RNA sequence: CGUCGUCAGCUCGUGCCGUGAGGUGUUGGGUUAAGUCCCGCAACGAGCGCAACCCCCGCCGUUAGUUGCCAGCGGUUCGGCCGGGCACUCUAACGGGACUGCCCGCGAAAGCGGGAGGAAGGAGGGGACGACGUCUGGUCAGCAUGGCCCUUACGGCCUGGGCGACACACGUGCUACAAUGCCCACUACAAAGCGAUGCCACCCGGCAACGGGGAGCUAAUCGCAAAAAGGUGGGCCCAGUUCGGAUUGGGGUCUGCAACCCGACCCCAUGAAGCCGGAAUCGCUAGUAAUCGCGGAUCAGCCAUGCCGCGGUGAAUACG
RNA sequence: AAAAAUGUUCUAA
């Protein structure tokens, strides 16, 4: 994982769409293509969409799903079996 | 054996080095 | 996707990763060899003709 | 498809390299490009005039292209005032003092890739191209050589089903590493497409 | 009907898009 | 007073050598006659064919040749001739003291 | 005072120095049974003086680099063998009946391309 | 240090927890497939189980 | 081979007991070229051959080989499209090679832990007459007396 | 470029035979790795092939003597370290050396068996080298190129996704199932290569991956570097184990704008199948197979167990 | 002195 002695990786465009709702009384639903992003705890209780590479898939973001990546919660291929 | 990356056989193998095998 | 991807490999990026190789003779993005600035086959070209100084078909 | 090129075969025992130049790993390609790119002036250049051979040689910021050129009239120009136009304008891209001599060819008839030049020529002129192969190979062998083939390939005539169509004279041993045997191609275009001319010249054993 | 294989059912051309 | 010589062509090299080992001897007097170095060879291996035919290559090396000479008492007169020599072009020169 | 003779074996070289006294042998300034320790094929390096009964007529100052130890007793056994005659040549006779005054050129075969080793080749199955 | 019944208690409680907030590695714990990145394509046996052998599609008769 | 015999390669005498069929065996002991093992393991047994059953190790050893060495054995022809067993009699080179062969896999079965106390043991047993390589060569020799009807059908 | 196949073959000029296709020569006896060579002959020659000339390895000479080497004397903090020296080792160019040259025996000859000298003997080992052709073999995606087709789109930029999917099936491989083994400590011996936003000595922090300092090296000098199997010594005691190291939890490191999909590595924990593999099936004739480790191209990193090389140890068997 | 059947249509470059 990411060298902690770095910082903890969020894209900076994401972060500030947040720290702005969090200001003004938010939240609107927030799309981004950052699933790079993490989890920050600024974020818990927005819903931000992300792509999947073909829809932005609306994410809810609880205190338990902190130290992760948000592209860990929109998958990218849809599988459904054989059969 | 070579598989076994805890033992100064395993890295040989993958050629690193660490507490198993130092330098 | 050839010329336009001649072009790009030349102009520097956004970001050092995004930098790589291509022939300089051809275009060929695989088997570009850092010595020469050449592909794999354009090497095999040039060299037979001998163009390539001191380069010579090894044997042993 | 299976025969090695019979130069890059003789690389230091018949024949010697179209440049001769040192240079470390640090900047070797560099030269490797100018290399090319100058040998590309000329032969767009100089084609007109029977290019045969372009040896490049250097030093240290100074280079040394030698042509060697069938009729080097067509070279030289105006006394001088062609080579110049490109004495000059081979240092628009080389930068460094770019002299530039013009060499004469003993006989055109054992150039190899002058040849085949000449066939493919006459076959993007729409000749008999049997006779053409036939008609250079007698050429060569008149002017003293010890052996001589030539080989095309393509869409003969503009026949559909494409073909092989050679003739040889003399010997040529390919397997001979002491035999010093020019060999150049030439490339037909046509409007039909494209067709491939082989010359191998035996000029005699060392 | 566009760029290469598999076809779309126009002679020639197949389903790949730019 | 040393001078090393480099090239792709050991006849150039090797001949190079011996014109300027002389050329120190003719204003002499000591020098340390030629030593060769071990040559450096950076090899290529290429599929031979231009589509997938894996187990079919062609080998091409390339050399570059070492040689290191040693001109002991300098003695001007050369100094100043060596400067004036007949070095070929396949080959550089590296002087030292 | 010295009798040499150049051993060379499968990219071993050896220079033995053939001296008399006790017996003393010494590879490396190390001892020999100390630096073929184990190796149970140590008393091969020495057959040459025994079929001319040096034994311990001898000494031998050796030295040995490159290869492996294997390689580098069979380069002595070469060297002495050498060094033997070297000090007289009607030693000759009685040591190559033996073999003592050949060199086997047996060298690691290159590898070729389109193979695993030099000539074990990859595994074939039609279909 | 914690032991074997109260590790396989935390063990359990991790895996439990990433199915639950349904990420990608929970995913992969539900349908019981490879966590790490391996190919799926051709191997994962220790984590797909016993060969589940089905047919194949059949190759054209002559004539 | 197809155009000329084989030519049998001559081993070095092995240095202790200066017997080359020391190193036939030993050289059937090797696997993957460790012949400083198999040298070891083989004198080993002669240290548990001369304790046990106080005796020459060497001698013990020529007479388990030479009591494994099989005289008869069937080989297969072709007579019309017949898979035949010919008894046909063993080379001398060919009797030594199957012998030791044998002596090696029979003490590789042997139950005993430690190598060189497997070849001891079966070493000890084949000079006197029992032996898992012993049953493999009487084994080899009663096919042999068995199918004699087609003795007729040697080459 | 693949391939038949390094297989021993494919042809031509003139003469002769035949209405003609075609034949002869190239068939025949002997020989050879070989259409290699001998002898025979309505054929006599000639070309493409075979061999040879080229490269590496094996012995010896010359030429050289630093960054390489240390035989013998002088020092020495005991390191070829300093004096010196180039003998040797080596390094890298130029040569010599093997030709069935000699002896015996067979033979018409070519050759064949054997012997001697010799480092090497019947082509010394290996490589480079691939006939006329075959396969409408492969490549329009390396390149080139005729014809067909697209033109605010079948072109071009971007962000994200995918090329890494997984009821299944095959191929080429890696690691094993163990005691001729596994583990810890200590101690030996390579070759070929790479290395100035590179190789990194050495020093401290850290269990470690690493980090921080920090000399030397434009490199026969400095570094990558330790080779590993080996040898010595201890531990395991026949157990799904101190065999095996898959899978999963947790915690780190680094490269990188960025490691969710989808990186390598480190440490704790976990510790699967696997007890030598059905029908079937592959490679190798000697420094080969097997086994051991090392390096390089590509490359920020790396999914390399792949590929191309390198040396260590070193067998079995071929009747036919 | 022979275990063992078969190979869709047009094209042969
Ligand atoms: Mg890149
Ligand atoms: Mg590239
Ligand atoms: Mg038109
Ligand atoms: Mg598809
Ligand atoms: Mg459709
Ligand atoms: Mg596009
Ligand atoms: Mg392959
Ligand atoms: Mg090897
Ligand atoms: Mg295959
Ligand atoms: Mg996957
Ligand atoms: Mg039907
Ligand atoms: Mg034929
Ligand atoms: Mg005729
Ligand atoms: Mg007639
Ligand atoms: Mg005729
Ligand atoms: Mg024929
Ligand atoms: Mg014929
Ligand atoms: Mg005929
Ligand atoms: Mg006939
Ligand atoms: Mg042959
Ligand atoms: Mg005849
Ligand atoms: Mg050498
Ligand atoms: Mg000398
Ligand atoms: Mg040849
Ligand atoms: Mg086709
Ligand atoms: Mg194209
Ligand atoms: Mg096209
Ligand atoms: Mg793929
Ligand atoms: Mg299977
Ligand atoms: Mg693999
Ligand atoms: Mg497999
Ligand atoms: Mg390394
Ligand atoms: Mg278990
Ligand atoms: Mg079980
Ligand atoms: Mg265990
Ligand atoms: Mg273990
Ligand atoms: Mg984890
Ligand atoms: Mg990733
Ligand atoms: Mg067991
Ligand atoms: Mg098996
Ligand atoms: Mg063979
Ligand atoms: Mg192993
Ligand atoms: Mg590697
Ligand atoms: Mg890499
Ligand atoms: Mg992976
Ligand atoms: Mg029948
Ligand atoms: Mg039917
Ligand atoms: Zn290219």
Redesign the interface.
């Known amino acids: 994982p990411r060298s902690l002695k770095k910082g903890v990786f969020v894209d900076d465009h994401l972060l500030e769409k947040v720290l702005e709702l969090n200001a003004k009384g938010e939240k609107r639903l927030i799309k981004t293509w950052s699933r790079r992003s993490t989890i920050v705890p600024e974020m818990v209780g927005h819903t931000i969409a992300v792509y999947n590479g073909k829809q932005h898939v609306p994410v809810y973001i609880?205190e338990?799903?902190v130290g992760?990546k948000l592209?860990?919660?929109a998958?990218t291929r849809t599988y459904r079996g054989?059969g | 054996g070579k598989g076994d990356r805890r033992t100064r056989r395993g890295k040989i193998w993958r050629g690193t080095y660490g507490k198993y095998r130092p330098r | 996707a050839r010329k336009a991807l001649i072009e790009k490999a030349k102009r520097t990026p956004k970001f050092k990763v995004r930098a790589y190789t291509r022939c300089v003779r051809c275009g060929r993005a695989r088997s570009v060899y850092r010595f020469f600035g050449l592909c794999r086959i354009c090497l095999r070209e040039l060299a037979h003709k001998g163009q390539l100084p001191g380069v010579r078909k090894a044997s042993w | 498809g299976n025969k090695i090129h019979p130069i890059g075969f003789r690389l230091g025992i018949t024949r010697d390299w179209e440049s001769r130049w040192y240079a470390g790993k640090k900047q070797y390609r560099h030269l490797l490009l100018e290399d090319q790119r100058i040998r590309g002036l000329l032969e767009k250049e100089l084609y007109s005039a029977g290019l045969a051979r372009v040896d490049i040689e250097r030093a240290a910021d100074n280079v040394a292209v030698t042509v060697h050129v069938a009729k080097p009239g067509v070279v030289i120009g105006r006394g001088g005032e062609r080579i110049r136009v490109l004495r000059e304008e081979l240092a628009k891209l080389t930068g460094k003092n770019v002299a530039l001599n013009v060499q004469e060819v003993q006989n055109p008839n054992l150039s190899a890739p002058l040849v085949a030049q000449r066939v493919a020529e006459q076959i993007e002129r729409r000749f008999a191209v049997r006779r053409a192969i036939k008609q250079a190979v007698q050429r060569v062998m008149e002017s003293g050589a010890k052996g001589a083939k030539v080989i095309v390939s393509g869409r003969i005539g503009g026949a559909e089903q494409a073909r092989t169509e050679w003739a040889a004279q003399g010997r040529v041993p390919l397997h001979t590493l002491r035999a010093n045997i020019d060999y150049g191609f030439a490339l037909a275009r046509t409007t039909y497409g494209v067709l491939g001319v082989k010359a191998y010249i035996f000029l005699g054993e060392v | 009907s566009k760029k290469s294989k598999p076809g779309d059912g126009k002679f020639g051309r197949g389903v790949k898009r730019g | 007073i040393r001078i090393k010589l480099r090239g792709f062509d050991h006849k150039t090299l090797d001949a190079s050598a011996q014109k300027i080992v002389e050329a120190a001897r003719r204003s002499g007097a000591q020098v340390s006659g030629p030593i060769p170095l071990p040559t450096r060879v950076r090899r290529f291996t290429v599929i031979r064919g231009p589509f997938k035919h894996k187990d079919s290559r062609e080998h091409f090396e390339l050399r570059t040749h070492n040689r290191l000479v040693d001109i002991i008492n300098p003695n001007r007169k050369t100094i100043e001739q060596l400067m004036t020599l007949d070095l070929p072009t396949g080959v550089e020169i590296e002087i030292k003291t | 005072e010295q009798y040499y003779g150049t051993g060379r074996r499968k990219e071993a070289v050896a220079r033995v120095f053939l001296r008399p006294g006790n017996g003393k042998v010494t590879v490396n300034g190390q001892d020999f049974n100390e630096y073929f320790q184990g190796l149970v094929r140590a008393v091969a390096a020495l057959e040459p003086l025994r079929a001319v009964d040096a034994l311990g007529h001898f000494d031998a100052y050796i030295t040995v680099r490159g290869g492996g130890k294997s390689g580098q007793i069979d380069a002595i056994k070469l060297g002495i063998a050498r060094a033997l005659v070297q000090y007289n040549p009607d030693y000759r006779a009685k040591l190559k009946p033996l073999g003592f005054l050949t060199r086997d050129a047996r060298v690691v075969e290159r590898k070729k391309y389109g193979k695993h080793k030099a000539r074990r080749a990859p595994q074939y199955s039609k279909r | 240090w914690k032991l074997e019944g109260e590790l396989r208690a935390e063990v359990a409680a991790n895996i439990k927890?990433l199915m639950?907030?349904?990420?990608?590695?929970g995913?992969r714990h539900r349908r019981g497939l490879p966590v790490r990145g391996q190919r799926t394509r051709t191997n994962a046996r220790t984590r797909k189980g016993p060969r589940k052998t089905?047919a194949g599609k059949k190759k054209a008769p002559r004539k | 081979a197809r155009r000329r015999r084989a030519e049998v390669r001559q081993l070095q005498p092995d240095l202790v007991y200066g017997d080359v069929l020391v190193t036939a065996f030993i050289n059937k002991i090797m696997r993957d070229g460790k012949k400083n093992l198999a040298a070891r393991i083989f004198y080993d047994a002669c240290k548990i051959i001369q304790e046990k059953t106080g005796q020459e190790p060497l001698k013990v050893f020529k007479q388990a080989v030479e009591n494994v060495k099989p005289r008869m054995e069937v080989r297969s022809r072709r007579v019309g499209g017949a898979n035949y067993q010919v008894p046909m009699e063993v080379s001398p080179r060919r009797q030594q090679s199957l012998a030791l062969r044998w002596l090696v896999q029979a003490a590789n079965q042997r139950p005993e832990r430690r190598a060189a106390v497997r070849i001891a043991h079966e070493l000890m047993d084949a000079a006197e007459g029992k032996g898992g390589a012993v049953k493999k060569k009487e084994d080899v020799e009663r096919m042999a007396e068995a199918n004699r009807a087609y003795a007729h059908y040697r080459w």
């Open positions: 609880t338990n799903m992760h592209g860990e919660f998958p054989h | 927890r639950d907030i349904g990420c990608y590695r995913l089905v």
